[PDB]
């Protein structure tokens, strides 16, 4: 299982206890689907947890009826109880549209993260593989980063 | 019935009393489904006791109208009165939905533990790894059943949680 993406120059095939059971190529495919999805989610999460600090919170309201603003909703884990409940419902609705529009069952493009984004791409298959591996590595880094950021927000009083 | 799941290393086919041991495969199917469901609900209850003590009660309200604020509610055989009646009704409604959405009855796959909940993702074409997971589910369910009864008694006699 060395040649199926990942397996970058740092370390080799990192599996201290996993995939050593029987291989089970389809289990690895499911875990790769989960890894790509978690990596994309965590990349978005890290970007949206660091951007309200690099750049000021969006100019607007986010809830004109409830008089909220993007600037008076605390960044980070304190925003779960501050963003309007209907706003969270709409965010989850967009996530559900992403997760249910195209099929994600086994043996499908949705099972390998292939939905059709196509914006960051190329035509040279070697470059395609390099960019896919870069996405996977950035996703793993973002997973660990966003978990660390969540715990920094929790243990401390606020973000960072 | 000595080749099924269950029977393990510490004790073999355990049957101090006369249950099973007379064929009655359908009765054994009923008892296995009962054991699996009881173990699952138990494991859940065991966690529902340990977690509010190891980590702490949830950060929320559970009743924004009544302002119960989660943490005000105690843990174990005392939340029965604190948690609002509609909250208990909703919990029992979710349990009833879990029961009735599947069709537990002779032969159909809901009578062996498969309730359509396909989390704890285990793959096809790899048995003797699914079977190990199912045996672990059974063993943890048995341990959790005895444990949750013990926790009930501990709370009742000691007058509070643990």
């Amino acid at each position: 299982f060395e040649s199926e993406l990942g397996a970058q120059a740092p370390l080799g095939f990192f599996d201290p206890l996993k995939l050593t059971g029987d291989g089970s190529v389809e289990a690895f495919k499911r875990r790769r689907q989960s890894e790509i999805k978690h990596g994309r989610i965590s990349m978005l999460a890290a970007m949206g947890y660091m951007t309200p600090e690099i750049t000021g919170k969006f100019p607007g309201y986010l809830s004109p009826s409830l008089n909220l603003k993007f600037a008076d909703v605390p960044n980070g884990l304190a925003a779960v109880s501050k963003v309007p409940a209907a706003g969270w419902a709409q965010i989850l609705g967009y996530m559900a549209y992403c997760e249910t529009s195209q099929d994600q069952s086994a043996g499908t493009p949705g099972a390998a993260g292939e939905f059709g984004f196509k914006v960051i791409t190329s035509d040279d298959d070697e470059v395609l593989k390099r960019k896919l591996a870069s996405e996977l590595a950035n996703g793993r880094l973002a997973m660990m980063a966003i978990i660390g950021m969540f715990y920094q927000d929790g243990l401390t009083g606020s973000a960072w | 019935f000595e080749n099924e799941r269950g029977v393990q290393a510490p004790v073999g086919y355990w049957d101090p009393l006369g249950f099973a041991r007379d064929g009655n495969v359908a009765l054994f199917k009923i008892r296995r489904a009962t054991e699996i469901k009881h173990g699952r609900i138990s494991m859940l209850a065991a966690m529902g006791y340990i977690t509010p003590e190891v980590t702490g009660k949830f950060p929320g309200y559970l009743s924004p109208s009544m302002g119960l604020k989660f943490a005000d509610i105690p843990n174990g055989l005392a939340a029965i009165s604190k948690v609002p009646g509609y909250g208990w009704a909703q919990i029992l409604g979710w349990m009833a939905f879990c029961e009735i959405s599947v069709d537990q009855s002779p032969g159909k796959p809901g009578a062996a533990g498969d309730m359509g909940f396909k989390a704890f993702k285990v793959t096809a074409d790899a048995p003797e790894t699914t079977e190990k997971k199912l045996a672990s589910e059974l063993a943890n369910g048995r341990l959790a059943m005895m444990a949750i009864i013990g926790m009930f008694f501990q709370d009742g006699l000691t007058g509070s949680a643990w």
Partner: protein, 194 residues
């Protein structure tokens, strides 16, 4: 000629031949000849089951208290008055669903046992236990159920009418200074010197 085993001075009633409780062949009036035996058996089983649950409820109601708020009266007859309206509606809904989904809508004397293999009294609640066993043992279990059902029907009737005559709870039987039940009120043909 042939006579009923239970009632030796009456003819042996037909339609009781192959049935769980038919060996005693007790049917003096003879509803067997008039009605479908499947419906009669289903009604007997349902009455027995309802009355067994009713007997344990009647006995255990003044014990196991009640819904947080309502006062399960010692005399179980007033529990209907003490019952919440929501509780009654939930009970009615549950009974309707249970008894209407059990027969797939064929819940009537003309249509219930008309499909084919509708076993009388077999709603599928744990029928697998009888799916094993050995004929005679399964019939013995069904006979146990039938006899307990009849016993509990008569017993629940007795409990209700004991609470009527005593005007009190079931268990404190024959209270102190009983000296017999009070004579029945309300008029009759013999009350106005018939």
């Amino acid at each position: 000629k042939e006579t009923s085993a239970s009632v030796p001075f009456l003819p042996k009633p037909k339609n009781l031949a192959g049935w769980v409780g038919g060996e005693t062949e007790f049917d003096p009036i003879g509803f067997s000849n008039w009605f479908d035996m499947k419906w009669l058996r289903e009604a007997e089983l349902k009455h027995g089951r309802v009355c067994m649950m009713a007997t344990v409820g009647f006995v255990l109601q003044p014990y196991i208290g009640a819904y947080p708020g309502v006062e399960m009266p010692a005399d179980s007859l007033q529990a209907v008055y003490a019952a919440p309206s929501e509780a009654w509606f939930a009970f009615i809904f549950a009974a309707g669903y249970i008894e209407s989904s059990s027969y797939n809508g064929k819940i009537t004397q003309l249509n219930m046992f008309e499909d084919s293999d509708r076993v009388p009294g077999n709603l599928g609640w744990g029928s697998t236990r009888l799916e094993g066993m050995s004929k005679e043992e399964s019939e013995l279990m069904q006979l146990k159920e039938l006899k307990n059902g009849r016993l509990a029907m008569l017993a629940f009737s007795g409990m209700v009418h004991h609470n009527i005559v005593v005007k009190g709870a079931l268990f404190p039987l024959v209270p102190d200074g009983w000296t017999g039940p009070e004579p029945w009120a309300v008029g009759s043909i013999m009350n106005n010197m018939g």
